[PDB]
Each structure stands twice: as C-alpha cells, then as structure tokens.
Amino acid sequence: QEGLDFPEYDGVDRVINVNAKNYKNVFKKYEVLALLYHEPPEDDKASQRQFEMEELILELAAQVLEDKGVGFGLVDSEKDAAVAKKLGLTEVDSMYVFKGDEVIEYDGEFSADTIVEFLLDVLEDPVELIEGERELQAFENIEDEIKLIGYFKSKDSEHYKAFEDAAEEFHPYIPFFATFDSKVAKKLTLKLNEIDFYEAFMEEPVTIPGKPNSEEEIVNFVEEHRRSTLRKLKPESMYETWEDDMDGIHIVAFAEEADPDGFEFLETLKAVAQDNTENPDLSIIWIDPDDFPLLVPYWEKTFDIDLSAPQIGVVNVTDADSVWMEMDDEEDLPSAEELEDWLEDVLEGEINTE
Amino acid sequence: QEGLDFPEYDGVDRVINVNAKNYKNVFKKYEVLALLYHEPPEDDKASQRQFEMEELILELAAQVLEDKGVGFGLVDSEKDAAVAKKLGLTEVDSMYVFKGDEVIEYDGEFSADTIVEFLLDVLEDPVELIEGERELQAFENIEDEIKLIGYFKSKDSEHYKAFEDAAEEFHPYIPFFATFDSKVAKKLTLKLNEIDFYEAFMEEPVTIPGKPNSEEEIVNFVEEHRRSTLRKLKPESMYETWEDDMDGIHIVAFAEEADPDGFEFLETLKAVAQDNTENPDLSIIWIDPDDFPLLVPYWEKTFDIDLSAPQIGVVNVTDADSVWMEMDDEEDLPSAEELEDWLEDVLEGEINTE
Ligand SMILES: [Ca+2]
Ligand SMILES: [Ca+2]
Ligand SMILES: [Ca+2]
Ligand SMILES: [Ca+2]
Ligand SMILES: [Ca+2]
Ligand SMILES: [Ca+2]
Ligand SMILES: [Ca+2]
Ligand SMILES: [Ca+2]
Ligand SMILES: [Ca+2]
Ligand SMILES: [Ca+2]
Ligand SMILES: [Ca+2]
Ligand SMILES: [Ca+2]
Ligand SMILES: [Ca+2]
Ligand SMILES: [Ca+2]
Ligand SMILES: [Ca+2]
Ligand SMILES: [Ca+2]
Ligand SMILES: [Ca+2]
Ligand SMILES: [Ca+2]
Ligand SMILES: [Ca+2]
Ligand SMILES: [Ca+2]
Ligand SMILES: [Ca+2]
Ligand SMILES: [Ca+2]
Ligand SMILES: [Ca+2]
Ligand SMILES: [Ca+2]
Ligand SMILES: [Ca+2]
Ligand SMILES: [Ca+2]
Ligand SMILES: [Ca+2]
Ligand SMILES: [Ca+2]
Ligand SMILES: [Ca+2]
Ligand SMILES: [Ca+2]
Ligand SMILES: [Ca+2]
Ligand SMILES: [Ca+2]
Ligand SMILES: [Ca+2]
Ligand SMILES: [Ca+2]
Ligand SMILES: [Ca+2]
Ligand SMILES: [Ca+2]
Ligand SMILES: [Ca+2]
Ligand SMILES: [Ca+2]
Ligand SMILES: [Ca+2]
Ligand SMILES: [Ca+2]
Ligand SMILES: [Ca+2]
Numbered sequence A, B: 001q002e003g004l005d006f007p008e009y010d011g012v013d014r015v016i017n018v019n020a021k022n023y024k025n026v027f028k029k030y031e032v033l034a035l036l037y038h039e040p041p042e043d044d045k046a047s048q049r050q051f052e053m054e055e056l057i058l059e060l061a062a063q064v065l066e067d068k069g070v071g072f073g074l075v076d077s078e079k080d081a082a083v084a085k086k087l088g089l090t091e092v093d094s095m096y097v098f099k100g101d102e103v104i105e106y107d108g109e110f111s112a113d114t115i116v117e118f119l120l121d122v123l124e125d126p127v128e129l130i131e132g133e134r135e136l137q138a139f140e141n142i143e144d145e146i147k148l149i150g151y152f153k154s155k156d157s158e159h160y161k162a163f164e165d166a167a168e169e170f171h172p173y174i175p176f177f178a179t180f181d182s183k184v185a186k187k188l189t190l191k192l193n194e195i196d197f198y199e200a201f202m203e204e205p206v207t208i209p210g211k212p213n214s215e216e217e218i219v220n221f222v223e224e225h226r227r228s229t230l231r232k233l234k235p236e237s238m239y240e241t242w243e244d245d246m247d248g249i250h251i252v253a254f255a256e257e258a259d260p261d262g263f264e265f266l267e268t269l270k271a272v273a274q275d276n277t278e279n280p281d282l283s284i285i286w287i288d289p290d291d292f293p294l295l296v297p298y299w300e301k302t303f304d305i306d307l308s309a310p311q312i313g314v315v316n317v318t319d320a321d322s323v324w325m326e327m328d329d330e331e332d333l334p335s336a337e338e339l340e341d342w343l344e345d346v347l348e349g350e351i352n353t354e
Helices: A023-029 A045-064 A081-087 A112-123 A133-140 A158-170 A182-187 A215-224 A235-243 A260-275 A293-303 A336-348 B023-029 B045-064 B081-087 B112-123 B133-141 B158-170 B182-188 B215-224 B235-242 B260-275 B293-303 B336-347
Strands: A032-038 A070-076 A094-099 A102-106 A127-129 A147-151 A176-179 A195-198 A230-232 A249-254 A284-287 A311-316 A321-324 B032-038 B070-076 B095-099 B102-106 B127-129 B147-151 B176-179 B195-198 B230-232 B249-254 B284-287 B311-316 B322-324
Touching (some): A023 A070, A032 A045, A045 A112, A070 A081, A094 A112, A102 A112, A112 A235, A127 A158, A133 A182, A133 B260, A147 A158, A147 A182, A158 A176, A158 A215, A195 A215, A230 A260, A260 A284, A260 A336, A260 B133, A293 A311, A293 A321, A293 B112, B032 B045, B032 B112, B045 B070, B045 B112, B102 B112, B133 B182, B147 B158, B158 B176, B176 B182, B195 B215, B230 B260, B260 B284, B260 B336, B293 B311, B293 B322, B311 B336
Parallel strands (some): A032 A070, A127 A176, A147 A176, A230 A284, B032 B070, B127 B176, B147 B176
Antiparallel strands (some): A032 A094, A094 A102, A147 A195, A249 A311, A311 A321, B095 B102, B147 B195, B249 B311, B311 B322
C-alpha cells in the first residue's frame, strides 16, 4: 500500500478524439503525443466492449504519464481521414507516438503497463554512454536485441551527433551506445568514429563501412540489417514482429529460458542460429512462454503442443495452422545437426503446414 | 492475429461467491481452487467499480485456466466469516490457492496475466530434476531467488520423498531441485542425501545440517532462512515482501539491471550483500523499475527521486516517508566501502526518516 500503491483510474477524461479542429492545439499542449489510429467500432457487443476497453487502457496510461508531459488521443480512420493523412497515420490499430521530429509506431501488446513502459522508454535519450570496464560489461550482456556502439572523441564530435541523429530514427527499439573511452574502444576493437553493429544473439559484430558515418549511412546500414536470424518476441513489439514476414509463415521456437530443458534447447538454437547466420532466408522467432502467460493455453490448444516442454515448428499466420518438430518428450531434444536438418527441410518446403 | 490472439472475456459467470452452503460443491468441481478473501466494498460508485474490475480480472483468469482444472471464487469476510475461518482465510485481499493438501497464499500484483502466470506455476510439479551438465548450468544461472538442491539415489528414495514433501510447502515461491546424477552432485559438492540452500544472490550455499533430512527438518531450516540479505521485488509476491518489513522500514535499492549505471550499482550492491550476508538485521529490497512501469511516476513523486538513476534509501512503511543516499548523478555511485558505511548508519539509526 504505502510506498507501493498502483494507480487506479480517477474517471477524468484525458483521452479525446483528435480531429481537424483541435489537432494543432493538442500537439501544442503535450510535449509527447500518442495517437491511436483506429477504425470505427462495430455494433457487436464483443467488439463494442473491446473498443471501450482500449480507450480505458489509454485513460489509465494518460493519468499515470500526465506529469511527464505525455498525451493520448484517438484518430478515426474514416471521420478523421484528412488528419490521418497529414500526420502519417496509415496502419489501423497502431499507436503513433510523436516526439520531437520523429514519429514512432507502437505495434505491441495493448495493456496499460506495456504502453506506459514503452512511453517511459520513448522519454529517455536515444544514446546511452559507456565509460569504464563495468559499463562495458553491461553492454556485452545485451543479447536479445540488435545493438550499435560507436567510438567518438566527445559529445561535441560531429560524428557523435550524426550517430545520435540515426539513433532517433530507431528509438526506442534499437539501443544505440557511444563511448569516448579509448580503453573501452580498444577492447571492442573500435577505431575512432567506427560503429559496430551487433545482430541479436550474435557474438561477432559487423563494422559499418565508410567511416566516418553520416546519419544517412548509419540509417541505411541498419535498415539493410534489420532482420536478425534469431529474434525474441517481446510484448512491446509483438505484432510488429508477427506481421514482419514475407510469406506470412514463421519458424517459431518455444523455450522457457529459466527451465533446465528450455535452457538446453535454447543453447542449441542459439548455436545453430550463429552457425547459419549468413543465410539470408533463415529467421526464427523465439517465444519464452513465461513472457506471455495469457497466451499459453491458447497456444497449447491451437498448436496441439505442451508448452512445459521446448518446441520448434512452422506457423501460418493466415489461420494459425502449424506443424512441429517431433520429440519423444522434453528430454529428447535435437542435436545441432538434427535441428539444422529440420530447418533446412523447412526452408526447402519439405516440412510445411500445407 | 492468428497465432497471437489474446483471450477476451466471454461474459460467462465462472467466478461466484463461495459460502457455507456451496463451498464443498465448489471444491469438488475444480482440481485447483483459488479463493479471493475480501472485505465488502464500500458503497460509493468508485469503490463498486474497482470491486467489479477485480472480479472481471478473476473471470478472465477463470476462462483462460478452465480447461486446466482451475476455478476461482470470492469469499466475503463479513457474510462468510464462518467458512473463511474453517478454510483458513485470514488475510484480507489475499487469494488462497488450494492444491492437494496445501494452501498457497497469493499476495502479489492483482493483474490477470500475473495471476494466470502464478497459477500456471502452481500447476507445475514442485521438484525440478537436474541431469547432465547443461541442466546444471541452468540451475547455476538462477540467482534472484532462493533455491534448494538435493542429491538422492532415485525418486524411490525415502529422502527424496521427504524433500518433495518440503517442496510443496513453499510451492511455487522457492524452486526445489533434485539430482540423481553423481557427476552433477560432485560438481555441486553434494554428498548423498545432502541438501544445499542457496540464499538469493549468494555464491556459497549453506548445507542443511542433520542429514538425512525429514520434511520437518527442511521446512524448519527454510523458514529460519526465509529472508535473503538481498531480495528482488517481484510482481507475484510484491505485497508479501513489502509487508515483511524490518521494524517498520525497508532499505530499498532502485536499479535498472539493463542500464549500464544500474548494472554498476547492482554489482556493488550484490558484493556488499555477500560480504555482510551473515547479519540477520540487514535486508535490502532491490526494485528494478523496469518491472513496475505503472509505479514509476508514483515512486518518483512519493519518494522524490530520479528513477532514471540508481538509488538506495530507507522507506517507512506506515506513511511512505523516506530518505535517500545523496549522489550528484547516475555517475556518482558509492564504492563498496561507502555503501557499507551508509548501510551501517541506517542499521544504527544514524540515518533515518524521522
Ligand atoms: Ca491503488
Ligand atoms: Ca476518453
Ligand atoms: Ca496493433
Ligand atoms: Ca525521421
Ligand atoms: Ca499491426
Ligand atoms: Ca525501460
Ligand atoms: Ca541532433
Ligand atoms: Ca532523421
Ligand atoms: Ca528499447
Ligand atoms: Ca573492429
Ligand atoms: Ca562516410
Ligand atoms: Ca506495424
Ligand atoms: Ca516466412
Ligand atoms: Ca523442465
Ligand atoms: Ca529435464
Ligand atoms: Ca544473420
Ligand atoms: Ca513472466
Ligand atoms: Ca534435459
Ligand atoms: Ca529424437
Ligand atoms: Ca495444416
Ligand atoms: Ca482477442
Ligand atoms: Ca462472477
Ligand atoms: Ca494482497
Ligand atoms: Ca497482504
Ligand atoms: Ca502485464
Ligand atoms: Ca512460469
Ligand atoms: Ca508425498
Ligand atoms: Ca507439509
Ligand atoms: Ca517460482
Ligand atoms: Ca558440499
Ligand atoms: Ca535428520
Ligand atoms: Ca500475506
Ligand atoms: Ca544510464
Ligand atoms: Ca553511465
Ligand atoms: Ca544472508
Ligand atoms: Ca518490463
Ligand atoms: Ca514528493
Ligand atoms: Ca559523491
Ligand atoms: Ca557509470
Ligand atoms: Ca560505520
Ligand atoms: Ca521525514
């Protein structure tokens, strides 16, 4: 209770419809503005209470973040079509966050805490500094996300400023790090103004060519290397990741990292992904079921799998049709060779959902 | 949406009031029964709305976990005082989970996902086996919670069965591990029938004396060593931890593990905690603000601290009055000796909230 009191919605109306009349003043009122771009709801009671539930979630987030200068609004895809075209709102059910000169699309779990955590991340500065051996270890501990790190003279360096400009383009989904510490740069093998790109779960980085790097060179490189061989599904971006597949067919690996059997399978998956990381056609989404408890019974019934054991399979996003690697039980995990056999069969189409 | 469809409440009334007339019927209907013990809500509209919101959270959890044999019910502390006393429901706002011969008290964040995640943990078996070096590594990776591991001949061992009996008494809050692997036991330095107790964040375990250990011997040891020197606040048990104050105060350390500065402060805190782990009067609650986004603005306003930087201080649990260690900014972290001197001043009353 005292010192540990979750906020409860006070009923004050803070999330309003944004339209051609007020959108210019609403932007002036709030330093950071989050606009949910939505289609008009249907009269169905299941979709009626659904839409009212969404706005109340934004109402709680608006209350929690009021003092930090964050505002929330709603934009109707039909009623406010001219406003949506002017602002760049194009994907229904996405929430567009306006910070400075940037527009950030939120396409993640629509819950109050996930949205507030995301907005708190948006409020942070886009570049994290690294100085000393212990901060370097914190950088090295990052593995489940893409990361960049550059070595510059100081914050006054023109090349640091270009690095920060590029960081703003991907904020807050890709952490950018900068060091002015020559001893840190030496251990990372970074020469002056060099920037290293670390693919998720990869040990070895890729150095951005053509140093020093303009904002344009960094942004183009990151866009070219956007898709990791192994990606971890995260609530803040779960629908963006789920929708980011060419043929709507995912290789999905379920592994509970804290469980001994899940850990064993995760080791093999990471090693295979590392050994095959140059394959431009291989991409695997790792889901830790402990990150999505409300989806665990849904997954087990829809996929006909037991999520207390590791799994890897093929999922068709059209109708959740799926096929899974055969294991006798949790102790019959594939070797790296067996896993590589199975992935090659999936890429060739020999193993499929159809 | 297909493959990533969060469940929505279907309006079916699955959570009902459990009273002296129906309580035996309800226990018979469900394998596992979770009963929320609550006072009657106040009659004003806001109090009524908040109560209906909490029951809808339970209705969603009951819908998600219906096929797994879980049911939820409400017990009124005024209307149902007799049946509450008979069932051992004594702490208002606690949810008591009945599995087998055990009653598990839930005293954590009242959210649908946290509750469903907790119930899925309850449904798991209370002892996890360790076999092989890679599963041993998974055990060694556990550090933010108390863990026990024992070496027995097989599942048929009388001493394994006593170990499993004791595990059920702390399920699912303290993971119990067992190995029948002599190679794993040798690495852990476990002799046959020995049980090692690992306090959270400690590198060295404490062997339970008096092997072979009966259930009562294990339960008494764990209860006597229940409070770690450094314990992490977790949503599943946040109120149990917060209500376990030390003479009306908590020493609270805010540190974001993923942030380089939070990581640095966390290293020092873990080292000081290990160096002072024998002091029974020292206990520190580590809060990672990334784990409680909905409480971050509340904390910054209530404690008057900047949660973008690491913090440690004293919090009075009666009125949330607080005092915090002064640091210029996130780079002005205390050394291990400075942190230990500050903790000593707190334990002597030289630093206090009054
Ligand atoms: Ca509250
Ligand atoms: Ca509203
Ligand atoms: Ca969406
Ligand atoms: Ca831009
Ligand atoms: Ca989308
Ligand atoms: Ca954060
Ligand atoms: Ca700039
Ligand atoms: Ca730009
Ligand atoms: Ca981020
Ligand atoms: Ca290099
Ligand atoms: Ca260049
Ligand atoms: Ca999108
Ligand atoms: Ca595909
Ligand atoms: Ca297991
Ligand atoms: Ca196992
Ligand atoms: Ca790759
Ligand atoms: Ca979880
Ligand atoms: Ca195994
Ligand atoms: Ca096999
Ligand atoms: Ca099929
Ligand atoms: Ca749904
Ligand atoms: Ca009901
Ligand atoms: Ca409670
Ligand atoms: Ca309580
Ligand atoms: Ca949540
Ligand atoms: Ca779990
Ligand atoms: Ca037994
Ligand atoms: Ca017992
Ligand atoms: Ca647990
Ligand atoms: Ca030993
Ligand atoms: Ca004994
Ligand atoms: Ca309690
Ligand atoms: Ca920092
Ligand atoms: Ca720093
Ligand atoms: Ca201790
Ligand atoms: Ca978080
Ligand atoms: Ca204040
Ligand atoms: Ca100082
Ligand atoms: Ca630092
Ligand atoms: Ca002293
Ligand atoms: Ca005071």
